[PDB]
């Protein structure tokens, strides 16, 4: 079973990445299962909707009373040393909120870190149906 753990916001970095104090250690977290438009992307630097997805993740974690991280059941850090997790701001999953607004698409999923994949795909199908942001 997955469980939520407390964390503290240090800084939002991009739509898909936030730095948190987790267990008294500063680290960078990559949001599981979502691909956002980026402002810190190699070659293609600032993409269309990159500003807007960065601003949305920043506003959601900055205004939160409690942030929690939920690891999935496979590896907990990627090859760049980033924590791989579902991030919750006051009980609402940031990964799902971005997909529901059309500011992220669900990533190509493989491997054991796939628990909320069907939930996110349902939210993406709704954002697409409503022609929101990435899908307008």
UniProtKB/Swiss-Prot annotation:
Positions that bind Ca(2+): 16, 35-36
Location relative to the cell: Secreted
Active site: 30, 38, 82
Superkingdom of source: Bacteria
Biased amino acid composition, Basic and acidic residues: 116-132
Residue ranges of the region described as Disordered: 116-136
Name of this chain's protein: Nuclease A
Species whose genome carries this gene: Staphylococcus aureus
Name of the coding gene: nuc
